Each structure stands twice: as C-alpha cells, then as structure tokens.
Amino acid sequence: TLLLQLTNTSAYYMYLLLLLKSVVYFAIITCCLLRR
Amino acid sequence: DIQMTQTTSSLSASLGDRVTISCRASQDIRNYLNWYQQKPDGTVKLLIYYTSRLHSGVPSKFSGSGSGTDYSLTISNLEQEDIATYFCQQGNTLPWTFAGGTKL
Amino acid sequence: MDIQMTQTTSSLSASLGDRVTISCRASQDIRNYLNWYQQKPDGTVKLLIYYTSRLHSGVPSKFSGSGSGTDYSLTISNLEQEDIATYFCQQGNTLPWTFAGGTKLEI
Amino acid sequence: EVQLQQSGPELVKPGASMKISCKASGYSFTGYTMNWVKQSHGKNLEWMGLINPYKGVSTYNQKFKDKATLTVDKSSSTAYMELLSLTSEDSAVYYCARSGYYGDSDWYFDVWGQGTTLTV
Amino acid sequence: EVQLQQSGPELVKPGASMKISCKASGYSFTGYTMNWVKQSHGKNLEWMGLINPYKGVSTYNQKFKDKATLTVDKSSSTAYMELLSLTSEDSAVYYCARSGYYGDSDWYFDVWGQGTTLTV
Amino acid sequence: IKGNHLVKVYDGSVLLTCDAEAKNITWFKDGKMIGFLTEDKKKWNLGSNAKDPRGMYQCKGSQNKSKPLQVYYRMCQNCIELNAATISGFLFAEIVSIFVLAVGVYFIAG
Amino acid sequence: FKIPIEELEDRVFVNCNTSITWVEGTVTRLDLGKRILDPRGIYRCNTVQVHYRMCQSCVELDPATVAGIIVTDVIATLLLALGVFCFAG
Amino acid sequence: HTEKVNMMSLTVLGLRMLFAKTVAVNFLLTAKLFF
Amino acid sequence: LDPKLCYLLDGILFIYGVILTALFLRVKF
Amino acid sequence: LDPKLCYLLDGILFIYGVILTALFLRVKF
Amino acid sequence: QTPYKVSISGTTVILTCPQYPGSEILWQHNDKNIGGDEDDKNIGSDEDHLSLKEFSELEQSGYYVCYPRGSKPEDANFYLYLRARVCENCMEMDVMSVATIVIVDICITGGLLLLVYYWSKNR
Amino acid sequence: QTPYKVSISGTTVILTCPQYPGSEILWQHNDKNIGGDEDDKNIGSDEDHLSLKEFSELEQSGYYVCYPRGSKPEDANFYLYLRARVCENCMEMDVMSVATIVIVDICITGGLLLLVYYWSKNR
Ligand SMILES: CC(C)CCC[C@@H](C)[C@H]1CC[C@H]2[C@@H]3CC=C4C[C@@H](O)CC[C@]4(C)[C@H]3CC[C@]12C
C-alpha cells in the first residue's frame, strides 16, 4: 500500500500544479474579459 | 425480598461457651450472606461477609459456615464485649432482608 | 589524565598449595573494568580474568577475582610449578589503558 | 480511620419532613456507595435503599420508595434522607451504612453510623 | 588454534627506525583490534596504542603518540609497528595484543604475542 | 538505564517512556522546559509517527535528568516517488497543460 | 458462562462447552469469517453481543483540508455560475 | 497508515472534482470571450 | 485503499465526453 | 500502477472531451 | 434484550445499556470494575452512556458487561466483546458514500447552473 | 551535544555523529554492535558515518548510538531512535520544496502565457 500512497501524494501535487496553472489562466481570461 | 427468619429466635448462652447462631432463608441465596455485630448501645459494625470471609479489624473468633439455606456463625470464647445481638443479612436479591437475630 | 594504576605488593612470598590474594588499587573508580594477566618467566603472558567477575576461555578454574570501586583482588589457590608468575592488572575506563608494576610470586 | 457521624435526636414534628445527615471523613465520599438501613421497632433491621455518591442516582426498597428520598451533598460530604409522611410507626433509628461502590461490594455494609433515634 | 608470532629480537642502533611484525593466525584478523604493548625494563607493562585492521584508524597513547606508528598489511594478516627515533630507553619487549573490535570488549587483551626483544 | 539513559521508546502514535519514579516526570525538549506531567502516565505522546516526531527528548524524575534521546522518524506521508513512470507522467501533464493553455491564449487575439 | 471470542489467523470464531444457538446478527465452534469484515450479533450458547470496528474503509479526514476543498469547490461552482451568467447576458 | 492513505485518496478526488469545475469555468469564460 | 474513486471521476468525464459526442454527431449531420 | 494508468485515462479523457466540445462549439458559431 | 449500542465517534466510545430501564447501571471490563470513580477520568458511566475518551485498542478494550445496581457481575450472562481501532477526527465511509457525495455535488452544480441560466434569461 | 544529523537518500541512510571529533567512532544498534566486518556488507561504516545501504523497513531500525574508541557503549553522551521509511527514489516534499516547485511552475506558466500572448497577437 506504500506505492499507492506515493502515487496519491504525487497526484495531489500534480493536480495542485494543474490548479495553479488553471488559476493563472483564470486570471488572464478575467483580465481579457475585463478588457472585453 | 426473600424472608429471612432464624430458627432459634431466642436462646440462652453461657459465658465462655461456643454457641452457633442458626440462620435460614426461604430460598437458596448462593452463599450471599453477611453477619453483623450490633452492640446494644446502638453502634453496629460488619462482622463477616460472604459467609466465609473476614473483615479487617474483626477478631478471628468470628467465622461462618453453611451452604444453601442453613447458615451458622461460629463464635469462640465469648467476652463481655461479645455480649450483643447478631444479624444475618441476605445479600442476594434486592432488597437486602435482615433477620430477627438472637440476644446474648 | 591517565590513571596512575599501581599495585601495593610487588614481590609476594608464598608456597605450593597456598591460597593467597594479590591486591591492586586504582586511582579512580573504574566500574568493574579490570583484567588479570600472568607473566611466565620466559615472557609469555595471557589473560586469566576479564571484567573481574567472569573467567577467560580456556583458563583453569582455580583463578578467580572480585572487588569493585577502587579495591580489586585476585583469588588463587593450589599454587604449582606452572603457577609461578607475575600478575598484572589494568584499567578500562579512560584511554590509555594503564597497567601496574605487577606482583611476582615467590616460592 | 473512616468515621460516619450523624445528627442528634433531630426532633421533627409528625407528618412533616425529617432530615438526617451522615458526614463522611477519612476517605473520599464519592468513591463509596452509602446505603441507608432503618432499625424497625428496635429489634429488626430492614433496608431502605442506597444512593450513589458520585452520580447522585439512588435505588430504593420497593416497599419504601415513598417513605424517604435520599440526596447527597458532595461539597459537604454528607448524605441526606428526606422522610415523607412519617407516622408514629416510622419513628425509629436510622443507620447510614457505607459500602463498596461497585456491584461486588455494595451488598455488605462495612462501616455504619451511630444511628439517630428519630423520636417524636 | 589462535596464536601470534612476532619478529626476532633485533639489535637496532639508536636513532634509526625499527620494524617489528606480528602475524595473526587462527582467527579473522580484520575483525579484532590489535593493541601494541611495551614491557619496559622487564617489569612494568605500558600500553602504546591500538590500530584497527579494517578501518586503519589508530588511537595511540598520549605518551607514545609521536614515538610509535602502527600500520597494517591486511592481505598478509600482519600488524606492523614502525618505531621511530629509537633510544636506549626503548630496549624493551614489545608485545602485540588482540582485543575485541567493539567498545564492550576491546578493553581486555585476549591473546598476546611472543615478544620482540628490541635491543637498543 | 545505565548512565542516565532513562528515556526509551516502545498504534500510530509514538509511546515515549521514562525510567524514573512514578510521581512526577518533567519532559524537556530542545534544551528548554516543555513539559511537566503527573503520575500514572509516563508515556507522553507528541503525535502520530506520520507527523514525523523528532527532536531531543529528556525526562527528569526523582533521579538526575536523563540524557537526551533524539527520535528521528521519517515516515513520509508526503514523499513522492521519482520513478520513471511518475516523472514521465508529470512531464506529460506539464507539457499538455502548458500546450492547452497556449491554445487557449493563441485563440484570444481576435 | 463467560463465553469467549477467539481471534486466530485473523478470523473470529466462538468456542463454547456446548452448541451455539444464534438468534440475531451476522453469522461447540462456530466460524464468523475474518475480523476485518466487522462481525456483529448475539450468540447464546445454551451469551455475547460481539462488536467489531476494525475500520478498513476508514478515513482520517482533517477539518482543514476537507473544509478547504469545500470552501473552494463552492467558490468554483459560483464562478462557474458566473460563467453561465454570461451565456445570455 | 491506511487511514491517511484513504484521506489522501479522497482529497485527490476532491481536487480532481474541483479541477473539472475549473476546466469547465475556463472553457466557458474563453468561449464567451470569443462570443 | 480506495483506488476506484479515480474510475468514478473517469466515468463522470466519460459521460461528459459521450454526451458531447452524441451532440457533435447530431449537429454534424 | 492502476491509479497511474487511471490518471493517464483521466488525462486523455480531459483532452478528448475538451477538443470535442471545442469542435462542437465551433459548429454553433 | 436489546444490544449495546456502541457509538464510536472519533477518539471516543459510547457504550449504552438499554436492557434495564430506570435502574442505575454499573459497568465492568474484563471482570475488573470500571465506570464512575476510578484511577483514570477518561471513562465515565453517565446514565447508561459509558464514555471512553482516548480509547486504546489494547488496554481499554475487550469484555464489557452492564449490570444494574443491586445485581452481581457474576449474575449477568450477557457480555459484550469490543474491539475498535479508534482514530482522531476519523470517520468511516465506504466507496458508496463517496459516490453519493460526488453525485450530489454534480447534481446541485447542474441544478444551480440551470437556475442561474434561467434567472439570466429573465433579466 | 550536537544532535546526530541524518541524511536519508533513496534507500540508504547515512547516520552522522557530529560529536567525538578526531577519534575513531564506532556504532551500536539495539544494544548490538555494528559498523565493522560482519555477515552483511550492506551496513558500512566510515570515519564519521554509518551508511546502511539497502536500509530495511524494520530489520535495521532501532537505537543507533555512536561511541568513540575506548569509551563504553553506555558511556556515550547521546542516543538516537531511528524508524524511517524507504523507497526506490523517494524525495521528501517538504513545505519549502513544494512552495519552490509551485512558484517555479507558476512563473513558468506566466512567462509562457505572456510569450504565447505576444506571438499570437503578432500574427
Ligand atoms: C481548458 C482551458 C484551461 C483552456 C481552454 C482552451 C480551449 C478549450 C478553448 C480556447 C479557445 C477556444 C475556441 C476559440 C474560438 C473558437 C471559434 C468559434 O467559432 C467557436 C468556439 C471556438 C472553437 C473556441 C472553442 C474552445 C477553445 C478551443
């Protein structure tokens, strides 16, 4: 069950990195929507 | 509430004698009985419990016996302080029913 | 800082079959850490008692010792022509492990 | 030394409510179940009931549920009885009897009280 | 059996450098510490130091820190001492003694060598 | 036990006993006064092993202060594996996510 | 009497001096399967009400993370509603 | 041990639910920005 | 434990993909 | 490896769904 | 003859004895007296609720029996055997409960998106 | 009393004993001596380190104490209890490394999105 924990805590940072990229993409789309 | 009557309601015991106190119950109480020493001035203390054991501070001259219904107390070398009444107390079912006892 | 470990007796007079003790006093408390080496006349030495309580592997059982703190002693009986030697003690607490002057038996 | 001290005669009017304290000393009051045994007619003992000192919960004889109500005071280390509708028959001597807390020792009364002769 | 043979007695002139070997046989040599002990004047034993055969790290006496140097050729199961700046005070027997590897058993010298009468 | 070695270690939590009188044991940590406990519980807990309890612990009882026992737990619960599959998946997700965001920003100029 | 419960080879089975008479719950010696399946029930040997919560579907949810994911899921769905608010506005 | 592994699995699932929500909101915001 | 929550969210996204696939095939014709 | 292949399936489902709904909204321009 | 409702809640176990109504009920663990006044205050037999704060799976577990006041522990022949690996702030949920909560979340997400879409259509 | 600094990488643990300088440093494990020639060549030793290559989960975990040459094992001034988990290429993602990874990736994403915006606006 150790390798399952390793995959889970690798995914917990992978998806959080995807969340940070999606948050900054949300920031740029909000900036361009305010430009819109 | 099992009635607890002694077969010997009152008896005469001489000084320095070994006299047993017969106690009986309506039903078997699974040896759950205690004997109590009540001095006639009013003060009362635990003599023995569970018909065989001995309380702390109780003298070794007091011990009980019997299984089932007929229970007895063994008292040896009666003194002037030993002249009192004694109560067998059923400790089996609620409520704990005492007995009439016998004077000495 | 080294322990100046000395023996009170350097030459002990004894005889065959005698039970005699050998004294060795330490400068400090060395918590039951001694050894008891014997020196043959040709110079060949060996260990007899280590830790002052247990005996060496292959030693005769006639060698024994006791003591704790600073006063330690060796108990030996039935001295033979093989047992004439010089007997040593050493400390084990602090480096360097210092020996003593050694007690030589006399027949 | 474990000591159980009560009040005196405690003269109480008939038909009223009577109180009889029982002070606990030499031991922890909440650690030992204190029963209440009444000397009926000067010759026969019978059991009124008990009260848990640690939690205040009381268990009574089925004949004498309405005769008295047992309360305790943890700060005062005293056990109280509050007799309800006492008659000339109910004038008797009341013993407070300590025992063991749990079910293996709550059935023998180890140390008793002097007993207050509730006379009218 | 376990036994340690040493070099012969050498009449080494003062001021030169001597080399005495001591073989180790009958046991795993690299797993037991070799302690080098000098018997001055034929009476008083003096402990000069130990060299660990495995690591090669050697701890010396405070007096003989500079006057002695221990080396080990592990392949031939030998323990060497390169005595340097010899004096007539060094005309003594120089045993090598096996103790245990670890601190619970390195303080007793189990078996001892024959002894090189290093005459100066 | 020998020479002030009183603090021992024995259930996710770490059980940390001390060898002293069972009246009052004071648990110091990091060279300062951190704890002082009562009787009948000399097994002071800092947390589960997954919450990596570490540091110098020392107890003081009726005898002298115990010499410090430094626990060092590295039960990870936060350790990622740098195997080829995991780093390959992370690089794949990184490249795909940055490319998808780039397509999102390539089509925004109008 | 004091009817015992045996945990041998990670399995629960009741042992008595006579026959076991089950009355209610999950079902001399009567097997109950493993202990990880959490058996319960009343077993009256002519009596014990056994209970097991060796939790293997067991979660240690801390309030900080499960509160954070909720308070960010709610604001994510709120911004999604703001996105659908621009569908026809 | 496993009681924290399961909580890690649930918070990965919650992060992925919220990732699907944030991908949906970015897609809808970009599409309405183009519209 | 619980490695099948991933398959649950993958099933949710597969439902989303197939209800876009049906719409795309319908409006494509 | 089962959660990792499940996450690979998740990634390809995200990309397939995103591309397909991008085309489907390209139709409704 | 009701069973003992064992109310596990975090690092706290609540045993109940609803077999005897009204009577004061004491508790015994492994034929050793527990509940009420004891050495440790982590255990309290309030009413029928035998609370077990900081439950240990090895030393506070095992046999449990309730008996009313005025009844012997040896008289009772209806015991409980408890094993429960409790855990701090720690629920127990299967895969079906997680499926339920994700289905509820996606359903209320859709039901709020449709509501916001219609309130935007109106104004 | 400098604490025993420990450097775990992958499946090997390197127990450094910063006190006892200069002298030979030995080692002890569960009151049994290691750090020399023995049956297993996995547990090495050095002038300051006890490198347990291929560190086991529990077969090599216990009380690890250094003592200098000459000093007794119980004469050592310090102890360490080690119980660690190992992998093939695990790294401990502590808060500093996680924050650094997040800030590096968010700066990378910002720079790439700015550059993509620039060349998309240019064409
Ligand atoms: C998912 C987030 C992070 C990034 C979003 C990127 C994708 C999904 C976005 C970025 C630009 C978008 C496109 C921009 C322009 C057009 C052409 C128009 O006729 C219809 C919609 C369509 C086809 C959009 C569909 C979705 C789209 C491709």
Author numbering:
A (entry chain n): 241 to 276
B (entry chain A): 2 to 105
C (entry chain C): 1 to 107
D (entry chain B), E (entry chain D): 1 to 120
F (entry chain g): 25 to 34, 39 to 138
G (entry chain d): 22 to 48, 56 to 74, 85 to 127
H (entry chain m): 238 to 272
I (entry chain a), J (entry chain b): 27 to 55
Give sentences from the paper.
T cells in jawed vertebrates comprise two lineages, αβ T cells and γδ T cells, defined by the antigen receptors they express—that is, αβ and γδ T cell receptors (TCRs), respectively. Despite these differences in ligand specificity, both TCRs consist of equivalent subunits: a ligand-binding module—that is, the TCR-αβ or -γδ heterodimer—and non-covalently associated signal-transducing dimers (CD3-ζ2, -δε and -γε). The arrangement of CD3 subunits in γδ and αβ TCRs is conserved and, although the transmembrane α-helices of the TCR-γδ and -αβ subunits differ markedly in sequence, packing of the eight transmembrane-helix bundles is similar.
Despite this, the eight-chain helical TM core is assembled around the centrally located TCR-γ and -δ chains, wholly in the manner of the αβ TCR. Lys258 and Arg253 of TCR-δ form salt bridges with Asp111 of CD3-δ and Asp137 of CD3-ε′ in the CD3-δε heterodimer, and with the two Asp36 residues of the CD3-ζζ dimer, respectively, replicating the interactions of the TCR-α chain. Similarly, Lys261 of the TCR-γ chain forms salt bridges with Glu122 of CD3-γ and Asp137 of CD3-ε in the CD3-γε heterodimer, matching those formed by the TCR-β chain. The positions of the TCR-γ and -δ TM helices relative to one another are fixed by a pair of interactions close to the centre of the membrane, between Ser262 and Thr259 and between Tyr265 and Thr267 of TCR-γ and -δ, respectively. Sandwiched between these bonds, Asn263 of TCR-δ interacts with Phe266 and Tyr265 of TCR-γ, which slightly repositions the TCR-γ and -δ TM helices. Alongside the TCR-δ TM region on the inner leaflet side of the membrane, both the consensus and TM core-focused maps exhibited density suggestive of a coordinated cholesterol molecule, located within a pocket formed by Phe264 of TCR-δ, Tyr265 of TCR-γ and Phe135 of CD3-γ, that is capped on the cytosolic side by Arg52 of CD3-ζ. Because the potential cholesterol-binding site of the γδ TCR corresponds to the second site in the αβ TCR on the inner leaflet side, we tentatively modelled it into the cryo-EM map.
